[PDB]
């Protein structure tokens, strides 16, 4: 039991590390689109394609 649980403990520990590594790379690589779709709703709320 303790072998298993310690394994999963540090498993999710440096898993968590990889979680953050993915996270803040995506946190920036998801900004180039702040334009595109904002445009969409900006017209979808206004009723003219602009």
């Amino acid at each position: 039991r303790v072998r298993a649980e310690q394994q999963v403990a540090s498993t999710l520990q440096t898993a968590h590390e990889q979680l953050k590594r993915e996270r803040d790379a995506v946190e920036l690589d998801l900004r180039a689109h702040v334009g595109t779709m904002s445009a969409t709703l900006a017209s979808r709320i206004l009723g003219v394609d602009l």
Binding site: R1, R3, A4, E5, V8
Partner: protein
């Protein structure tokens, strides 16, 4: 007297080998129990793994 002494050692070895019977049944049951419980052990280990 001859009757009693022959009956004595007759019952003696009856007892001895029947005791071997019960205790060997016991050791087979012991290996059985160790088997089943360690199976339970690591099938719980993998439960905590997932």
């Amino acid at each position: 007297l001859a009757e009693a002494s022959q009956a004595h050692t007759k019952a003696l070895e009856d007892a001895k080998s029947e005791a071997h019977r019960v205790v060997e049944e016991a050791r087979t049951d012991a290996e059985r129990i160790a088997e089943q419980l360690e199976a339970q052990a690591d099938v719980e280990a993998e439960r905590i793994k997932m």
